[PDB]
Design brief:
Family (chain A): Belongs to the clathrin heavy chain family.
Strand content of chain B: 35-45%
Largest sheet of chain A: none
Distance between the termini of chain A: 47 Å
Largest interface: B-C, 14 and 8 residues
Number of strands of chain B: 13
Radius of gyration of chain B: 20 Å
Helix content of chain A: 55-70%
CHCR repeats (chain A): 1-104
Radius of gyration of chain A: 16 Å
Structural class of chain B: mainly beta
Order of helices and strands of chain B: EEEEEEEEHEHEEEEH
Strand content of chain A: under 5%
Number of helices of chain A: 8
Number of helices of chain B: 3
Distance between the termini of chain B: 13 Å
Protein name (chain A): Clathrin heavy chain
Shape of chain B: elongated
Order of helices and strands of chain A: HHHHHHHH
Helix content of chain B: 10-25%
Oligomer: part of a larger assembly
Number of strands of chain A: 0
Subcellular location (chain A): Cytoplasmic vesicle membrane; Membrane, Coated pit
Function (chain A): Clathrin is the major protein of the polyhedral coat of coated pits and vesicles.
Chain lengths: 116, 233, 233
């Protein structure tokens, strides 16, 4: 199925059993990420949609989840390749709020192409 | 030209091993047609098309073989005009205007029914002389008179008359009676049966009273139906 | 079901392959496909799978992504027939892509070039192969939406050799010419001489671009286009 598997990993987030969830995931998932994967950060149950969107390479979305998660270094480490105007405004505003300022300007470099 | 109903699905592909027929009837300058669209929704070519009708109230039959000469390939859809006439065997059906049809191809024979709108059976020579109208109305037993309601009509007598005329229903006389328009009309079927009508249009009444007199009153309900359709379309 | 009860090698397979003609239960047809894959002869069936398209390509495509053949190419056809291109090319990047995209755009359809390329840029591919496929002969193409998705990704720096080789013979396409104008905007200089000897580009376009940028150049833009009122405004 997908239903079984999707809601399964969903409940696994409900029971925070990631250290075996994401590992089982490597099999023939037959499921659909980014729908329960959404619900993860939607329900604030972070750190898994992290791994999901990781194994699906969902840059920005994963970086946004890093932000909400409190992960901010690897956030910019993913932004360096994501490089979406989204990614940039995210890292800007968050890192300013994150009160990191050096790396803040280091990432703000990449937006000034847009004077908006 | 008279009223022609939109084509309806008569035989769905899934009931006929992929053959889908849609159809309607028309009347073109004294000639009746069964106008159809045949579509091949199967995966085999279809050939050897043929059609027949069961015996029916007005003796309706195809007048020629069905004019499909090439294989109808998968996914193809053709329009077919089948000329009909009323020279065929008569058996009274219920409902009176029902027609049973069999269509064959190289795969199988399939059956369906459809309802003939009676206006295609309204002949060109159906305009009674005033004198004859009065006499015939009087001759027909009063118990044969039947009343029907054309609901929610707002056409003027003039427009009613012109539309009906286009369907070979003739207005013989009009009477203005204290604001009311009374239209006296005749029509004649392919089998020779006359139907006389009095249409009463009243001010403030959105419904017209159609009164029909016929020596075969069972037909009346069906004239009403198509009379209604012609006025509403 | 009584077939599949046993090994059910291919007998009722051929049976359906006959019955498929006006057989509109796509599930049994998909099982039939699975059978054709048991000993792979979909080659002669994938063709009718192009014809037969009354199914649900979802569990079909799932079966496919489980049905391992390594050279199947109807999956691309049903894909762009239903626009499953995103996830398709997604898993394609996941495993491999050398010519599948290429053989598709060359034989099947060079239409969806730009959208699939934008997908590649989304999945952050290796630009080189994009260059190479650009070198590969194509049919038709629309540059506008291509450079639009580019301006999303902001990484046009790579079709410019294609434009170089293309204008190298002198295609007077205002599209490609204003594209050149854009890459020169990027080049940060003054091609007014170019702006004049090129009547091919769209001055209105370059002007509505440089609205922010370079009025001192929108001057000659509107002067080629005689856009005096725009020059005012």
């Amino acid at each position: 199925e997908s239903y079984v598997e999707t809601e399964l990993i969903f409940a696994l987030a409900k029971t925070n059993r990631l250290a075996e969830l994401e590992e089982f995931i490597n099999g023939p998932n037959n499921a659909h990420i980014q729908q329960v994967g959404d619900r993860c950060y939607d329900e604030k149950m972070y750190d898994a949609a992290k791994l999901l969107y990781n194994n699906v390479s969902n840059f920005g979305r994963l970086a946004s989840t890093l932000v909400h998660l409190g992960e901010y270094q690897a956030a910019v480490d993913g932004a360096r390749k994501a490089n979406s105007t989204r990614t940039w405004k995210e890292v800007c505003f968050a890192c300013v709020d994150g009160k990191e300022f050096r790396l803040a300007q280091m990432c703000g470099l990449h937006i000034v192409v847009h004077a908006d | 030209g008279g009223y022609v109903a939109p084509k309806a699905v008569w035989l769905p592909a899934v009931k006929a091993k992929g053959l889908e027929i849609s159809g309607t009837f028309t009347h073109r300058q004294g000639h009746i047609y069964m106008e159809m669209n045949f579509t091949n929704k199967a995966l085999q070519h279809m050939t050897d098309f043929a059609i027949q009708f069961n015996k029916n109230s007005f003796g309706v039959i195809p007048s020629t073989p069905l004019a499909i000469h090439t294989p109808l390939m998968p996914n193809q859809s053709i329009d077919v005009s089948l000329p009909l006439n009323t020279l065929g065997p008569v058996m009274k059906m219920e409902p009176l205007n029902n027609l049973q049809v069999a269509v064959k191809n190289n795969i199988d024979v399939f059956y369906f029914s459809c309802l003939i709108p009676l206006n295609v059976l309204f002949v060109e020579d159906g305009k009674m002389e005033r004198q004859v109208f009065l006499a015939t109305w009087k001759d027909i037993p009063n118990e044969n008179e039947l009343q029907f309601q054309i609901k929610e009509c707002h056409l003027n007598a003039d427009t009613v008359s012109s539309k009906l005329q286009n369907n070979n229903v003739y207005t013989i006389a009009k009477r203005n009676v204290e604001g009311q328009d009374m239209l006296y009309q005749s029509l004649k079927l392919t089998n020779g049966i006359w139907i006389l009508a009095e249409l009463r249009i009243q001010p403030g009444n959105p419904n017209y009273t159609l009164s029909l007199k016929c020596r075969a009153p069972e037909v009346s309900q069906y004239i009403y139906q198509v009379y209604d359709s012609i006025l509403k379309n | 079901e009584l077939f599949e009860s046993f090994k059910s090698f291919e007998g009722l397979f051929y049976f359906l392959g006959s019955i498929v003609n006006f057989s509109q239960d796509p599930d049994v047809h998909f099982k039939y496909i699975q059978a054709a894959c048991k000993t792979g002869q979909i080659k002669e069936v994938e063709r009718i799978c192009r014809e037969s398209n009354c199914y649900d390509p979802e569990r079909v495509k799932n079966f496919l992504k489980e049905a391992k053949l390594t050279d199947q190419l109807p999956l691309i056809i049903v894909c762009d027939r239903f626009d499953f291109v995103h996830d398709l090319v997604l898993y394609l990047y996941r495993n491999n892509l050398q010519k599948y995209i290429e053989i598709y755009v060359q034989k099947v359809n060079p239409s969806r070039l730009p959208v699939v390329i934008g997908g590649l840029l989304d999945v952050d591919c290796s630009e080189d192969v994009i260059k190479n496929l650009i070198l590969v002969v194509r049919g038709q193409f629309s540059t506008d939406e291509l450079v639009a998705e580019v301006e999303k990704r902001n990484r046009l720096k790579l079709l410019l050799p294609w434009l170089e080789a293309r204008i190298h013979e002198g295609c007077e396409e205002p599209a490609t010419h204003n594209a050149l104008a854009k890459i020169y905007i990027d080049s940060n200089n003054n091609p007014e001489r170019f702006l004049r000897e090129n009547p091919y580009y769209d001055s209105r376009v370059v002007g509505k671009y440089c609205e922010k940028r370079d009025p001192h150049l929108a001057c000659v833009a509107y002067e080629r286009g005689q856009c005096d009122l725009e020059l005012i405004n």
